[PDB]
Structure 1
Amino acid sequence: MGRVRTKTVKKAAKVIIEKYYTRLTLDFHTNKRICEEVAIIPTKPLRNKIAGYVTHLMGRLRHSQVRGISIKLQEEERERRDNYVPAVSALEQDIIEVDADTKEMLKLLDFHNIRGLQLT
């Protein structure tokens, strides 16, 4: 609320999980320690800055992810979010619904004399 995450603690945060979400958890006091390995902070109060916020979003990472960040671990399942749902096709296989003024357009443009039933 009263303390706002600044640009340095936010815009630098968008890659460090994106590069190293693997082998990183929500446990803060060890993720506090991990900042020295992947990064170099000048001062540990900025480690007290940048590590608390990224641990204040790991459940929000896990549940209801918000734009601006990419996980790269759920990115491959989006191709299986590109799933065929069997078996969607034509609804009643023709379909027989016709507006009875495009029914002549089914007859005059198309030579298809296939089944069309009018519903008012």
Structure 2
Amino acid sequence: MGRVRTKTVKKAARVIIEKYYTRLGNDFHTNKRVCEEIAIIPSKKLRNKIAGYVTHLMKRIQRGPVRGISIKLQEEERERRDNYVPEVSALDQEIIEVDPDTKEMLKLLDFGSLSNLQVTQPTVGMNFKTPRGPV
């Protein structure tokens, strides 16, 4: 009841997280003791409010990737993306399941008679399309 933080405290908290993530710990009273030297805060009330939101945000950081940028999380994100190419190609299948009609397309593209190709049995029934209306 009546405990919503405003843009001021939330933005200041996010800014000091993305600036001083290394210099912060999970404690409230430790995090309130850094805001005096890492910033200028006109109020003690606003200072400890920001400190509490910083504790909440960094608890969430340790639990997950909050939209406030975390440098370490940035490098794990990077090494996930621009790395982990598997040892085997996901597109180097020894056999590829192929339509007779696409096989006919490939021989019209002069690529018939290729060993890595298996002609799939075409399905029978033509039962696509969802039933119309309710029921």
- Which of the five TM-score ranges fits, normalised by the shorter chain? 0.7 to 0.9
> Which amino acid letter does the alignment assign opposite residue 29 of structure 2?
H
* Residue aligned with 1:61, SS: helix
Counterparts of 1:70-81 in structure 2, within 5 Å, are 70-81=69-80
Counterparts of 1:6-45 in structure 2, within 5 Å, are 6-45=6-45
CA contact (8 A) 2:32 2:47 kept: yes
4+ runs deviating over 6 angstroms: none
TM-score w.r.t. length of structure 1: 0.86
CA contact (8 A) 1:103 1:116 kept: no
Q: How many residues align?
A: 118
Aligned to 1:88: 89
> Which amino acid letter does the alignment assign opposite residue 30 of structure 2?
T
**Greater gyration radius:** 2
Aligned to 1:61: 61
User: Larger relative contact order (C-alpha < 8 A, sep ≥ 6)?
Assistant: 1
Query: Larger deviation: 58-67 or 110-119?
Result: 110-119
Structure 2 residue runs of 5 or longer lacking an equivalent are 123-135
CA contact (8 A) 2:14 2:54 kept: no
Q: Distance in 1 between matches of 2:13 and 2:69?
A: 12
**Aligned residues: CA RMSD:** 1.8
Counterparts of 1:89-108 in structure 2, within 5 Å, are 89-90=90-91, 92-95=93-96, 97-108=97-108
Structure 1 residue runs of 5 or longer lacking an equivalent are none
Residues 48 and 23 from structure 1, CA distance in 2 versus in 1: closer, same or farther, beyond 3 angstroms?
Answer: closer
Q: CA deviation at 1:91?
A: 5.8
TM-score w.r.t. length of structure 2: 0.77
Q: CA deviation at 1:2?
A: 2.6
Structure with bigger helix share is: 2
